[model samples]
Target: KSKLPKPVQDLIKMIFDVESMKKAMVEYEIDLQKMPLGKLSKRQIQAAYSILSEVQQAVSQGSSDSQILDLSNRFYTLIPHDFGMKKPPLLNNADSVQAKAEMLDNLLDIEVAYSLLRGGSDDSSKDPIDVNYEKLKTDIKVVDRDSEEAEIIRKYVKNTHATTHNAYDLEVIDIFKIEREGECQRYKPFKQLHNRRLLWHGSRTTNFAGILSQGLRIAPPEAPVTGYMFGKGIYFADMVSKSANYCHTSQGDPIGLILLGEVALGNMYELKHASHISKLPKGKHSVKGLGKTTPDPSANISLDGVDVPLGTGISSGVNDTSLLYNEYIVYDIAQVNLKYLLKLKFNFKT
Candidate 1:
């Protein structure tokens, strides 16, 4: 009833059948113990080699015809090298005789299938190919093991593209003085505009000037806040999580933490108060009623034993066992980004 040519349809059916056979072959085991090797003449050995040559040709061309390629590649690796003709055509061992007979039968099956697919005829042969069946059996055992290892390595290197699916916890460990007036002006203005919705919430106008004039108008000179440009610090964290009380183990590699805050060169910070806050043991701590108007005590804070004008607030946190100060307030507490810290060429200690 269908208009497709018979050969094309047959070819398709043959391919499907071959694929099924290939799967069965994967699970198929050859019991050389049960095979029988009959005597072979020099001509029979040559016939087997020729059969293998055709199979190799099919494999090298990357044919998709399942019947031709699958069985061919399998048998190609299974067949033994040409041993030519000797006084005694078969090895004198029972196992050797059996293996040669089995290999000859495998070649015969493949040749039959290959010829059927293309309407070609194979050489006239009633005898099995000759081989040192003992050596052939040993070679096949080696191939079996090699195939297994190859499969294992294939699966091991296979990419799954799995995402870690973990959260990140971070803290500021060091602050570097950054003064990029031009770069800041270029990128920060847009950043501010983008953040305006949140920054100007519960406000009237979104105009930058209006917000600047209305919000915290200059740090009442009495408590002026000097801002730094950007700061970089080495933070310690082994895993990613959303816990604020997390820290990396001593053996964990230190990661870089970068901060783009509301600090600018020569910007003065008004100090409301300064106190030494001890590093509480590893656990959750609370800072209730902490004034939002006051800058982070840790930001723009001074390192211990370092003299900063009394008016300049400092950090109570210690870096390298030395008091850390002169830290800057992170711009927004809600939104932050991360990047790897690399090539830190300088390490200054107080």
Candidate 2:
């Protein structure tokens, strides 16, 4: 019955509620900590983590803008609002100043959803973006990540202006524009807004693989309904979430959008393994085609110059070990669901 998809609108509501609860929980925890024996119900704790988990899953599988918006709505529900962090009004028959405010809240929910889902961690080091964040540094030729321009733009979002329950003002782009307007005020020449706008658009284009892949998908007439992926996605997600539209992660930073980057890399390696496996006939599990016999007791195969646990002539062990001999390892974590500490083998201590 509304202009937006029903699923997206519903997800927006969930996102907003989650963020609101997060703020309330923080206050509750603060009060509890003041007590001699502080405690919270088990159900309450589970509810908190469960909310975050649902947020994460919703975002990870987001393949479209609407899907991402659904996650954004959840984010709006979790965090507190600051100067520019106001929500848009919901679009409906209320038709007064109140109605306008309601529509804006719905629009703002989109970005808040992403922030809640990301849960406040700065994983920038793990992400891949071409521009240098250390621009002002003498040693590093990069831009300052914490410059006033970025921070001012970050401060102006609020909950009421960011909800997704209605169409009038709630949308990710709307949140970003609100902050951008604030950012525009900070400039000297004032016309710099035009350049900044261009910069914003250009940066987005480069940061989303789907946008870069003008190499592949045909351009849509009005606009394409797509999600950014791969290396560029890391920055894209951060940028979108930060723009007044979403909630901050638990760590008080933006959450990222991931593409199957790690999985894709793993799949490529697996494909190579499959090709190698094809060389083997029925019931024959051998690694002779790899040009080296599996290591034996006399000589072991090396991982990072250290010997691994494989048997003689590779023929003695499964070909799985053979995959390692080539020195292929996945490097990027932001490309996949690598939310935890990633383990890599190194012989530094050994």
Candidate 3:
């Protein structure tokens, strides 16, 4: 019998799972004593963030090496981290502070998501997607198996699904055309903004509910702008495998969910290296982090005016930069519109 793999069965349970959420919390090694499933309130983040800020302030003015050791451990006590054997990092640099500060929001949301994966019917057992739809009210449709538009999406998933190397493969399980109830209306004013291209966003499954309900927002404005890989904004990528690496870090699941949003990258600025600047020029829409290997531009396709660069990778001939595949950044979060949410089976090999 062609039956569900245990991992796949577990994947379904993990979606609307109450017990599995606790399991996830255990894996993250939360004492649950320090911060329980539902009890982690804003106060926790306040303490952790303030601790982080103080540590950063101490390091910048060059406190004694011993002073930082005390401050760093103090910060870690509030926001737990496992360093194994190596010396733990002090929030010494601007980027380090920004990174940890941002993660405070993630920790809060993670606990928030765990609290309310609710709705246990005494008799009727509905799936998680159905249960979740009642709340967010986002629309979802499984793609028609073999149609013009769906096939185009399929190519983007399959063709673009290479890896850090060129030898990996994956299985596309389902493609859901997700329409966030009223999200489409907000995007029309900038509809025709040119150079529109679809991009990839992937995250671990544990944070899936937080991602959908909380949405893919940029970092909090309260924190100082330090730097991102490209800049301080939401990031997306072109090649499928590039995003997959992030989704697979769960290590707990062979199944993952990801997004392909049609970003209105109207006009772009190119950075061949990690400029890591806090601000872009006033007029530019995005930074196209160009690379030596990009999806073949010649084989590009379109899905209703949006460029789906579904072609396989090729030597892009452009030199320099730490990137190998095209990386995208949109400084203004409003310029992005999520189009498709895909469920994929990650099949790996040598």
Candidate 4:
């Protein structure tokens, strides 16, 4: 329903070309390296930092045309190669919801990457990959919540959480209790144990609920949603309401899934219709924002002087097949950008 103004459109095209150029640069990394560093001027350095800043702002403030323009201008200032108005790449849709979603989604991604590169930490001690099945089985069964295994999990969560700059807290950490004759997956924004029953006694368990009994193999990758699994964990069950998706095996086994913890920074606030977003409705008009007084939408304005309409909607990759509790939660890192775009579309659809 929205199209960029001429200036904004030109700016976006320029930004897209820059992204393409960046890809080419990576492919020709050796060539760039061979170029003399002495040839780099102070202006070049300034251009580099400016690029990083604009990308960061655009990402943090999605849909803000001014922020995007700022990013594009900085980029074009350094490199003035224009690819002409010959229609964008394969996914560029002037009116297509999916394409628009991706355009904004990738912008956010570029911003995140730029920020990380500019101000991120130097610590490279990668968190131990929580993929050891034998170890997980033993640790979950015998290890106490504070045990070494649990500590590793905790540390992983903490380190990742730090990356968020304390955007969330470690809320719940309950093990899968299959005896309850229900599901084991905890819904997002989990405040209590039995509030949301994701698991059920079935011939075979799968999806988020299936993870507890089936193991992380079933759980969505080691990601995190809002409430239940913090840090780089996943939501084996449905709680966070974004979309009812499930991480399953190749054979469609209802494998418990996980939601990568780091991605669940804030509640999924897309501007569309989502089963989960419908439930614990947040924002100025929702229950969550009710108690603490909501942001005055009438007075709300963005850096670009555009009004950002607030509401809930579907998320990136809104797969109808996997959605169980009408909840919108993501589980994979590689698929993050795709799913995020879906959420944006979902929000926009409404």
Overall lDDT per candidate, in order of appearance: 0.25, 0.24, 0.69, 0.26
Q: What tens digits encode model 4's per-residue C-alpha lDDT throughout 285-312?
A: 1111111121223432221122221212
TM-scores of the candidates are 0.15, 0.16, 0.82, 0.23
How high a TM-score does candidate 3 get? Answer: 0.82
Indicate which candidate wins on TM-score. 3
For model 1, the superposed segments whose C-alpha errors exceed 4 Å read 1-16, 20-92, 120-350
lDDT of 1 by residue, 139-238 (tens): 1111122354333212211211012311332332322222222333333433423211100011111111111111111111111011101211111111
What C-alpha lDDT, on a 0 to 100 scale, does residue 45 get in candidate 4? 38
For model 3, which pairs clash?
none
- Candidates 1 and 3, the one with greater TM-score: 3
What are the root-mean-square deviations of the candidates from the true structure over C-alphas? Answer: 34.3, 24.9, 4.6, 20.5
Error of 2 at 132 (Å): 30
Q: Which of the numbered candidates is closest to the native, going by highest lDDT?
A: 3
* Residue 162 CA displacement from its true place in model 4, Å: 35
Compare candidates 1 and 2 on TM-score and give the better one. 2
Model 2 Cα lDDT, one tens digit per residue, 1-350? 23433332332333234444334334323222331112323233333333333444454464454554454444234322231444522111212212222222222222233333343445555321211111101111111336543232223211212122122221122111111112222233322211111101111111122211111111111111121111011111111112212222222322221110111121222212323121223432121112122233443233222222223223334444323221112222222211111011111111
lDDT of 3 by residue, 1-350 (tens): 21433333343455556565566655655556656667665676668777776776786687886777787777678866555556667666666776676566556556656654543333245544445444445555666769887888778877776556444566777776767665677678668998899889886666666665655666554433443566467778888888877674433457777888989897799888777566778778888999778889999988888999999888888886678888888877677788887777775564
Worst 10 residues of 3 by lDDT: 1-10
